[PDB]
Amino acid sequence: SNAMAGLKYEDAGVNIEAGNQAVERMKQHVKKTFTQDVLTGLGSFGSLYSLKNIINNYDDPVLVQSIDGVGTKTKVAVMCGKFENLGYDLFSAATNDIVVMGAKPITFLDYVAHDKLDPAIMEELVKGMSKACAECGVSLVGGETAEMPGVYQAGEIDMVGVITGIVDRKRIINGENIKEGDIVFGLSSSGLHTNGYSFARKLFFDVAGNKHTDTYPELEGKTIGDVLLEPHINYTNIIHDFLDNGVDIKGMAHITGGGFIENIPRVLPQGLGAQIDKDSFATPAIFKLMQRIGDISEFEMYRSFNMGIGMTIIASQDQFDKMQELAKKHTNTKLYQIGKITNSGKVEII
Amino acid sequence: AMAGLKYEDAGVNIEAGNQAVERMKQHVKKTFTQDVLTGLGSFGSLYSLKNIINNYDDPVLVQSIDGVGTKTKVAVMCGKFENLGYDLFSAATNDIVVMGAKPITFLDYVAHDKLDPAIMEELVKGMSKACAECGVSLVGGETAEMPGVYQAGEIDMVGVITGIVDRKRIINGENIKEGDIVFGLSSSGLHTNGYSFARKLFFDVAGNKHTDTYPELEGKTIGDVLLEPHINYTNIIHDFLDNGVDIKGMAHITGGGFIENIPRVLPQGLGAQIDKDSFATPAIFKLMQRIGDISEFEMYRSFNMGIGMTIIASQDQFDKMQELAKKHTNTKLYQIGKITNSGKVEII
Ligand SMILES: Nc1ncnc2c1ncn2[C@@H]1O[C@H](COP(=O)(O)O)[C@@H](O)[C@H]1O
Numbered sequence: 008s009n010a011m012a013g014l015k016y017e018d019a020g021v022n023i024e025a026g027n028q029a030v031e032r033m034k035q036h037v038k039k040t041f042t043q044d045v046l047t048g049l050g051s052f053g054s055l056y057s058l059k060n061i062i063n064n065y066d067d068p069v070l071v072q073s074i075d076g077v078g079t080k081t082k083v084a085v086m087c088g089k090f091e092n093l094g095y096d097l098f099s100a101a102t103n104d105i106v107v108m109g110a111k112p113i114t115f116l117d118y119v120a121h122d123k124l125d126p127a128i129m130e131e132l133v134k135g136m137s138k139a140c141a142e143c144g145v146s147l148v149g150g151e152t153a154e155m156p157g158v159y160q161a162g163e164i165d166m167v168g169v170i171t172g173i174v175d176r177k178r179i180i181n182g183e184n185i186k187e188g189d190i191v192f193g194l195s196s197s198g199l200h201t202n203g204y205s206f207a208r209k210l211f212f213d214v215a216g217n218k219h220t221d222t223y224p225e226l227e228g229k230t231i232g233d234v235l236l237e238p239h240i241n242y243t244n245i246i247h248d249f250l251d252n253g254v255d256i257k258g259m260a261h262i263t264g265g266g267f268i269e270n271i272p273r274v275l276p277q278g279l280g281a282q283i284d285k286d287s288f289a290t291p292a293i294f295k296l297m298q299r300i301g302d303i304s305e306f307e308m309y310r311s312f313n314m315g316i317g318m319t320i321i322a323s324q325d326q327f328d329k330m331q332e333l334a335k336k337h338t339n340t341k342l343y344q345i346g347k348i349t350n351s352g353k354v355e356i357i
Numbered sequence: 358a359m360a361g362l363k364y365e366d367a368g369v370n371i372e373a374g375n376q377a378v379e380r381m382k383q384h385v386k387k388t389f390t391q392d393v394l395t396g397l398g399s400f401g402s403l404y405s406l407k408n409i410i411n412n413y414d415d416p417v418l419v420q421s422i423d424g425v426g427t428k429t430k431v432a433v434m435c436g437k438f439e440n441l442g443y444d445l446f447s448a449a450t451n452d453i454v455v456m457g458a459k460p461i462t463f464l465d466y467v468a469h470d471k472l473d474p475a476i477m478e479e480l481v482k483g484m485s486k487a488c489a490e491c492g493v494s495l496v497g498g499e500t501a502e503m504p505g506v507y508q509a510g511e512i513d514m515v516g517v518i519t520g521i522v523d524r525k526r527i528i529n530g531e532n533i534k535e536g537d538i539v540f541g542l543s544s545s546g547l548h549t550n551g552y553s554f555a556r557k558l559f560f561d562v563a564g565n566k567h568t569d570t571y572p573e574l575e576g577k578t579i580g581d582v583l584l585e586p587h588i589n590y591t592n593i594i595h596d597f598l599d600n601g602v603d604i605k606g607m608a609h610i611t612g613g614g615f616i617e618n619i620p621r622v623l624p625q626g627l628g629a630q631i632d633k634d635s636f637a638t639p640a641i642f643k644l645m646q647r648i649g650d651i652s653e654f655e656m657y658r659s660f661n662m663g664i665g666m667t668i669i670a671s672q673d674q675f676d677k678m679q680e681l682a683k684k685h686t687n688t689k690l691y692q693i694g695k696i697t698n699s700g701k702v703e704i705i
Contacts, residue, residue, distance in 0.1 A: 008654075009652055009653070009654035009655075010654070010655070011654075011655050012649050012650065012651055012652070014554070014557055014558075014649065015557065016553040016554040016556075016659075018426070018550060018551075018553065018612040018613070018659070019424065019426035019427055019552075019553070019612075020612050021612075049421075049452065049455075049456070053421075055417050055419050055420075055456075055527075056417065056419075056420075057415060057416075057418075057524065058416045058417065058521075059416070062406065062416075066407075067407045068406045069403050069405050070403065070405075070462065070519070072464055072496055072497060073400070073401065073497060073499075074464045074465070074466050074497065074498065074517060075466075075499055076468065076499065078501070079503070079505075081506075104400070108400075108403075113418075116420055116421075116422040117422070118422050118466075118515045120424065120513055148420055149421060149422055150422065151423055151424065151515075153424050153426065153513070155426070155427055157430055157508060157511070158427065158430065158507065158512075158513055159507065160505065160506060160507065160508060163505065163506040163507075164506075165468055165501070165503065165506055165513060167499075167515045169422060169515075171418070171420070171519065174403075176407075181397060273398060273399060
């Protein structure tokens with residue numbers, strides 16, 4: 008009775024076999040992200056989030072949400088066989104986009120799709136996401152996977168994350184008070200973050216013919232693979248620490264694709280510009296290396312890459328005092344003073 | 358300036374601006390309720406909870422992330438995408454509706470082998486239609502173009518629904534008991550599960566083209582039957598709950614069909630008896646069965662068989678539910694079974 012036809016097909020969301028050490032390990036990573044506000048939910052990784060505590064404070068609590076993917080960095084992780092940071096990359100890629108609003112991130116969900124994927128690799132992705140969540144008080148409340156060989160090319164993966172945060176309406180940061188003479192501050196990046204990896208991968212491994220274990224003069228022993236796979240920094244805690252301690256941040260911009268010129272204008276009031284002193288901050292070795300190998304102009308590098316600044320903060324000069332002191336405990340990034348606001352209407356790098 | 362000369366560009370017109378993108382933005386804006394905060398540009402919109410907070414003792418934020426599966430391949434094959442956007446919304450949203458949550462915001466990500474703004478416009482039209490029907494605001498999204506990741510012409514989509522429920526009102530099945538009744542609401546077709554099986558049957562086993570039809574599909578092409586959108590149960594479930602129907606549990610019939618999904622909401626040990634002839638099974642399922650000579654078990658293991666949502670409640674709730682269901686003309690209510698102490702699913 009109840010025969011099967013012997014045809015080849017499967018649900019996209021098929022789960023990983025029962026008993027695989029991976030699923031329990033993943034649940035253990037996920038549960039470390041929970042605050043006291045988390046309730047049981049639906050499915051293997053589903054939870055709910057009680058709002059009672061977080062909103063007690065706000066007269067008009069506002070929900071702030073954003074969804075983002077990792078992008079082509081996945082291909083480098085796969086080539087190197089190192090996924091330890093890629094889950095963390097995903098979290099930062101989504102979350103920094105709401106941090107700029109002054110929002111407090113509270114929940115995260117993720118989707119990972121592929122043709123085939125070793126459960127061991129998934130456990131590593133989840134470990135990394137959960138590490139990023141746990142460190143800044145975000146609860147990972149759900150996730151999904153899809154295995155679709157007729158959609159994904161062999162060995163390829165797409166990862167998407169959705170962050171949700173809360174801000175009091177009157178405390179939304181959107182740059183409206185920015186004025187000429189305000190200062191541009193920058194927090195260092197760890198390298199490319201999650202932009203530019205198609206170029207990086209092809210430059211080193213298809214054009215130059217390197218292996219990921221190779222090094223170069225600029226890297227002083229560190230491998231190309233390791234330098235490329237450094238995680239996109241999670242700026243949640245440092246920004247929270249600044250805001251919690253009364254730093255008057257007037258605007259922020261997360262430096263992703265298209266460098267300072269693409270990203271800073273969003274936050275500038277109409278008619279205002281910015282001037283960035285490129286020599287005021289360190290350019291990570293990986294950028295210096297790519298520029299040299301490729302015979303790429305300064306102009307074009309700054310057009311495309313973050314060049315060492317992953318987040319910008321606009322505030323009056325006298326806020327540097329408090330920021331510098333507060334930044335010391337945050338050892339994953341470095342605070343610089345990098346520029347100033349002008350009445351040019353343009354972002355200029357000098 | 359003088360006669361008889363070439364016009365450099367005579368014989369070629371190139372559409373200016375970004376007309377698909379602007380129409381897409383217009384569809385999104387129609388979803389906005391008064392709680393949406395705008396004027397933040399490229400980011401998306403924000404969402405004020407002030408009205409929520411007023412109306413809830415301990416509000417709980419309920420969220421779900423979902424894709425639609427390989428149904429996307431059928432949409433691509435047929436070149437039809439509006440229903441697929443609607444599919445995405447329903448696939449995510451129905452999974453929180455089962456807890457009694459009110460959906461409030463939706464975000465979407467769509468990745469493309471090659472991003473065509475006219476296809477995006479269509480997808481977003483469909484999502485926005487679903488949002489607007491049930492008071493959900495489409496507050497942001499993202500796209501990716503990844504030809505090295507995707508097979509030629511294919512896409513993948515992720516939707517995220519966010520809703521609110523009062524903690525005490527969370528429906529979780531804990532009060533289900535032996536003798537409670539299982540009710541079902543009709544589906545529109547396969548919804549968003551079983552498409553791998555469906556594509557294998559129609560396009561490989563039967564060797565049909567999506568433009569073919571069969572007498573039992575009542576004129577409609579295979580492609581169009583397959584592409585009917587996943588029903589959004591938000592409004593009918595809200596109608597039931599707002600008007601006093603004592604719902605003890607719900608199961609959204611997705612991957613694994615009745616067999617997987619009904620037991621998940623039952624207190625451990627309880628079972629269900631389902632009268633398979635108490636609800637209509639759309640012709641598409643009977644056709645697939647016939648093409649593949651598929652056993653009843655294999656059918657119920659993949660397909661919803663005509664019921665997209667199950668509701669467990671006492672027998673004496675049925676009268677009220679039938680009265681309330683009348684206005685909801687996109688789905689039909691049936692009484693389909695009962696709760697037992699069998700620890701399993703029995704189909705008679
Ligand atoms: N998948 C999507 N759904 C809805 N809106 C989107 C989507 N992708 C981008 N947008 C909107 O398109 C505009 C520009 O997007 P971006 O290219 O990410 O800057 C913003 O208003 C976004 O909210």
